[PDB]
Amino acid sequence: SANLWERFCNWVTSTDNRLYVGWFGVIMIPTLLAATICFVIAFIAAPPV
Amino acid sequence: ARRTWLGDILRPLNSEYGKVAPGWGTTPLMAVFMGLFLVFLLIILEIYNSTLILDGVNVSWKALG
Amino acid sequence: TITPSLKGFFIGLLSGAVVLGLTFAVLIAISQIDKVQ
Amino acid sequence: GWFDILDDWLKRDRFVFVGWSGILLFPCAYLALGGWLTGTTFVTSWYTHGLASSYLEGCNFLTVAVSTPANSMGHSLLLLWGPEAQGDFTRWCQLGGLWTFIALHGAFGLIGFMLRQFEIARLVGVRPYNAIAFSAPIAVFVSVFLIYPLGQSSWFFAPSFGVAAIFRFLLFFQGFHNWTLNPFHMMGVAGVLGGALLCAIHGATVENTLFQDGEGASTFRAFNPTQAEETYSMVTANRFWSQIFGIAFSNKRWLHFFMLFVPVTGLWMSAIGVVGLALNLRSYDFISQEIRAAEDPEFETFYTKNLLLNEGIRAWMAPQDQPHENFVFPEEVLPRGNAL
Amino acid sequence: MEPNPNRQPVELNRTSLYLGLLLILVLALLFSSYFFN
Amino acid sequence: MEPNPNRQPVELNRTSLYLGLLLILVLALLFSSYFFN
Amino acid sequence: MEVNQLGLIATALFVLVPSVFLIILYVQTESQQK
Amino acid sequence: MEVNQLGLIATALFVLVPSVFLIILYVQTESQQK
Amino acid sequence: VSYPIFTVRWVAVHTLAVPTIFFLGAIAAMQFIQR
Amino acid sequence: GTTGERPFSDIITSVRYWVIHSITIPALFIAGWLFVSTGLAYDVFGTPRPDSYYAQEQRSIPLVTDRFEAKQQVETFLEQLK
Amino acid sequence: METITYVFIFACIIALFFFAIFFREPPRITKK
Amino acid sequence: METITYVFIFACIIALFFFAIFFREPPRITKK
Amino acid sequence: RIPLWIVATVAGMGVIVIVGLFFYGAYAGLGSSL
Amino acid sequence: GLPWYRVHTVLINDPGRLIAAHLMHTALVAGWAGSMALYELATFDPSDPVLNPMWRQGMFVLPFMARLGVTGSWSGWSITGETGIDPGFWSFEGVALAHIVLSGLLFLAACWHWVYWDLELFRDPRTGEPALDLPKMFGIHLFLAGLLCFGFGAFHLTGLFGPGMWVSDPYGLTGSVQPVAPEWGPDGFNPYNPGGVVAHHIAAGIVGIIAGLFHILVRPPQRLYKALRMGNIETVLSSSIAAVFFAAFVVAGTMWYGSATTPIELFGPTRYQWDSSYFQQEINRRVQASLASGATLEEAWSAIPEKLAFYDYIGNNPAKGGLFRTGPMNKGDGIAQAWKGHAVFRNKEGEELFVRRMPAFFESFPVILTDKNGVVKADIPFRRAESKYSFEQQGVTVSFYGGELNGQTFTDPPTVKSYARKAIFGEIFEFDTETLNSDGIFRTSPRGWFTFAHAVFALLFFFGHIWHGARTLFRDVFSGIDPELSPEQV
């Protein structure tokens, strides 16, 4: 292993990913998955507000 | 082909393909459990069908609580 | 323990094996009495 | 090894091929046929259905039968040596032990027979489409003589082995299950009726589209048992039907597969329908119809008419058809039209 | 990726289409009554 | 009969299928509300 | 009349879906070169 | 709720029919030799 | 040829032939029972 | 087109056959006849004789009403001179 | 609504009939 | 019934999305 | 050697006789109605 | 090319895409499970576990979730009817949630295994071509099965590290989730004893673990490997199906006849309970007991718990209904509201009459009244011309004890006949037909449906077995036959 973290950073930043998970992506991808999943559930089954 | 981490670790488990035992191998021993299973089923069947009664075993909604 | 119906079960489990016996007995015997090739 | 010698002997080409299968087939098949022929002439159905059911009592080939066991027996296998008969033979007979005998034995006899087909096919090296086909008759026997009564109160409501004893099974299903109105039964008949058509039509099509291979009129001798040319003009047949019916075969391989499919698919559908009749999950009524018939006294269809026929069947038959229920229907409660 | 070598083409002739449709339609004509019940 | 010489083959690429379906589905998501009214 | 509400869609989808299946194949068969 | 009875089949056929159209084509295109 | 006697076919043939006649005899007797 | 068995045709024609079967066939027949005519069959199969369906007065049927004590119940049905 | 459904399918079967008889695949001999 | 229909279509669009992104026709250069 | 055609016509009448006895029994036996 | 009914043969020897396939399948079955649940949770009414329990609301998945522990909702209610309970995460919602996710994951997995179909693991080192060593696999899988089987019985059903299972009294009145101790005795083979369901999974589990190892070690005897065409996956199918339909025919039977595995408080009464007047006898027994302890007829019948009376109603008998009589049992007779009470019929002389009940077999049945000795005393005539027992001529009356109509009596012929017309079905109840717009035509319980569906599938699968089996032993002669002319000469 050339160095785990060094590799990690090389994967994340890799321009060979089908979808470019970037550094901003590391914050993007989770936050957007929370927003969408909560939304979809809310819009369908949430009770009166 | 395409090897992979998991793929190699599992490589042994899948390789002994056509490997068979010689002649009538374990067959006769197998043919005994088979006959035992057959009798075993016939018992639990006949118990459910109340053809084989056994004081202690009451095949009804009773014997429950 | 060993109730009348349980006794009957053996009687039927035994009378059955017998039939299988005599059947395969006769068969295995007559089978080994001709089949030349 | 003895095994291969046991094998050797069995698979020997005799007049009546035995085979491994035979070890199962012949014992059962004979006992089944035997038990029927026995009961048919000697055993009674008095203690079981309050009915005379054998020649010895005066019944003829139509009225004779091996009637089901009492309703008291439940789904009991009724073994000769079981809690009921208790090893006794005469009692066994009077409790309708001969029914479960014929049923269960014959059941295995049908397994053996299909196995035979499978076994003989393999040896002769032909495809097992004779075995696939025979699945249909199994399904029927299994669903009607086993699965059905297994869903009801007891063996008593399974079809009794006999000619007349089967006609009431028909009438019953009409009266109680309105079976004729069932989508699956319909498919059933569509297959058997339609299958008996393919049989007839193809046969006739062949005999009257034959080439001349002899100088006689009785063209039967004129046939080549050893293949070669087609014995009938497949090309002429095609043109015939293509002009009289508008549609016509043109691939003997398909025409023949079709002949397997139609009657086998039919019987399978008719089976499913009964498997549902076991749980009484019938196709008795049309709700939209009943609702209008309730509110509106002038609405009458051939459907409503039929249901009334059922009411009569149930009311007038149930008493002597279900003895264990000790039914008593006063003359005044008996549904009846005018004058009749 | 390598073009998977286990694939064959699929076929349905005209007659089969007809034979097909006839089955679907008539089944629909048979079950519609019970669907509307 | 003579094979009519005015016929050409028809084509619909994969992307078009997608673009198509996307249109159909979303329109359905837009009008269903008014269909159920 | 007093029929089932789903009767219509049950019959519709029962006809379309499988017919649609067949048609998809036939046409794709029909258009295979040579 | 108190919706339209035909709403369901109206939406169903609106989706199936044209989608079914496309698919028939795509698949028939897809299977053209060479 | 020098055909044998007791064969498998023979066995079969008799399992059905022997009972049959025994029954046909039985039934034939029933035709006279009365009351 | 052939197997070991001796062609039925020959056998059904052999004078030996008939010399055997002229004895055997009627034998079985007269046996079965006696089976019925001696009333034995009635007892082998518990089948009621023309005068054994009901008791003189009774017009009820001897319906077996419970599985386990059926045999016992059946025996009692024969009691009332049924 | 139901009447319409019954007649439709029927009308569809008759349509099929037509196409089946007059638009079948011509049955070609030997060289098929 | 309506809810089911709305969710169904939505789920179908998401299904589409997937296939569109991960099962498109690979975009080939020059020699196309 | 007993001529086949005689084996048949004798075994034949023999059946018409027994099966005919059955038919008579239908108007005399227990299967009667009298 | 390939006929339509063969398109899936494209996998017969492509272990990768075969796994990709079964992954998608599993995904759909898991997906269905999750979402079928949500459908039930969006329509199931917990407002009354006594007269309107899951099996009256056409619930099919909800019972299978209670049998193993999950008996609560995140919204507060619970199957048994308690409040304040905290189901934790594993509530009906939870289970439904879980499956939906497991489906999504299996989906993604199915995709990966499709694109990366040519993993080396499927190629035999020797022949260098695709191959799967079935005999050893079976051993592996079977080991895992028995290992998991063991655990299920050992920790779940016993309560050691789990909830337990559904257990109820002999008349479904107390039922709930409780830890069940094993039972290796003889009575542990009794279908109606929970202890047997535990012991089994522990014993069969172990035997399953043992048997697994064996097959991981011992190889298949040449004779067999040849006979049962092993090393040919389309035979694993033929055998599996045979087992699958065997399992099927069995579950269909235990559902119809009843067992500790199919409890009435979750699936509904049994047709045989109505046949033998099961619940009718338990009622009487209780009522006569109360009379012994010096209670009045009013008090006696009033003591009879509503739930108990409810089971004594033919409108809960799975043998009533129709194939196209869709929906819950409530679209039939309506949502049960309350027990009107026991109806006692009497005639001018004071004699007590009894209404002949309706056998499941009969769609419609006549109203006949007899005394203790079974003598017909009264009835509702068809042809009035010569009626001897009309309710009018006999002065028939009806009185109720315990329930809505408790203490009341009715004497005007029409009203008397109405209730008599109702007594035929057993205990008379008060239904709400408005809500669901019921039609008054009996429908079957989930017990009935599950039984029908599985009895069919099984019988259908048999054909699958017979078909695939044949196609394995006759692969060679498939496509057709060829030459020679041997037949009649050994």
Ligand code: CLA
């Ligand atoms: C081989 C063909 C065959 C088959 C499959 C059957 C099958 C059957 N017969 Mg049967 N039968 C046959 C031939 C056959 N018969 C013949 C030739 C006759 C004439 C003699 C009969 C006469 C006959 C009668 C008179 C009756 C049956 C009955 C039955 C059924 C129930 C019997 C049973 O419980 O078996 C039990 C199964 C066994 C005995 C198999 C045991 C095999 C194991 C491997 C041997 C183990 C033995 C060992 C001691 C056990 C050790 C365990 C230890 C703990 C004690 C069953 C369907 C009964 C029935 O029809 O009831 C309705 C019945 O009354 N049969």
Ligand code: CLA
């Ligand atoms: C086999 C498993 C199974 C079982 C036992 C049940 C059972 C039940 N479901 Mg159900 N369901 C299932 C699977 C199952 N479901 C699946 C997979 C789905 C997803 C689509 C649903 C979706 C569903 C819904 C949305 C609802 C139910 C409801 C119900 C309950 C009412 C009963 C019903 O409506 O019967 C209906 C039975 C039928 C109409 C019989 C269908 C038989 C068809 C017509 C035969 C087809 C024959 C074929 C065409 C012939 C061609 C062959 C030939 C070519 C050879 C009942 C408990 C209802 C409930 O909630 O109650 C309150 C309800 O609303 N279910």
Ligand code: CLA
């Ligand atoms: C993470 C693992 C997991 C867990 C914990 C559960 C848990 C549950 N599932 Mg489930 N499920 C899973 C994965 C899981 N599932 C997957 C992957 C699928 C897709 C295939 C499903 C599909 C599914 C459906 C469709 C349903 C459930 C249901 C349920 C619930 C009822 C359980 C039930 O009674 O099972 C019953 C268990 C059996 C079927 C017994 C299996 C025993 C077989 C017959 C033996 C197999 C032969 C064996 C190899 C022989 C060797 C044994 C040896 C020891 C002798 C329960 C909460 C039900 C529910 O109520 O809905 C939410 C329901 O309907 N699940």
Ligand code: CLA
């Ligand atoms: C254990 C489950 C199982 C599995 C894994 C298979 C697998 C297979 N079967 Mg099969 N089969 C099964 C059960 C199973 N079968 C049963 C129970 C039967 C008897 C009814 C059959 C009868 C059968 C036949 C007659 C044939 C196969 C064939 C095949 C092979 C090709 C499949 C094909 O391309 O279909 C193509 C599938 C479609 C394009 C048509 C499906 C349309 C269905 C009928 C409509 C219903 C869809 C619905 C979602 C199903 C619900 C599932 C239900 C069980 C819950 C394949 C290996 C074929 C083969 O041998 O080829 C040489 C073949 O001819 N099978």
Ligand SMILES: CC1=C(/C=C/C(C)=C/C=C/C(C)=C/C=C/C=C(C)/C=C/C=C(C)/C=C/C2=C(C)CCCC2(C)C)C(C)(C)CCC1
């Ligand atoms: C039961 C049982 C058993 C068995 C037994 C047996 C096996 C028997 C057999 C039997 C038999 C095996 C019998 C047979 C019989 C037969 C008969 C009786 C016949 C008759 C016939 C006739 C009469 C004919 C007629 C005709 C026809 C049909 C056609 C047309 C022409 C003529 C007219 C010729 C045992 C012991 C094991 C055990 C217990 C139970």
Ligand SMILES: CC1=C(/C=C/C(C)=C/C=C/C(C)=C/C=C/C=C(C)/C=C/C=C(C)/C=C/C2=C(C)CCCC2(C)C)C(C)(C)CCC1
């Ligand atoms: C991706 C993803 C996700 C999601 C997922 C989902 C959302 C899923 C869904 C799923 C689903 C939602 C599924 C469903 C399914 C269903 C089914 C599969 C069904 C079937 C049915 C059937 C088959 C039926 C049939 C029938 C009929 C129709 C009638 C007659 C009878 C019968 C029954 C036969 C998440 C976010 C988690 C994350 C990860 C990723």
Ligand SMILES: [Fe+2]
């Ligand atoms: Fe032919």
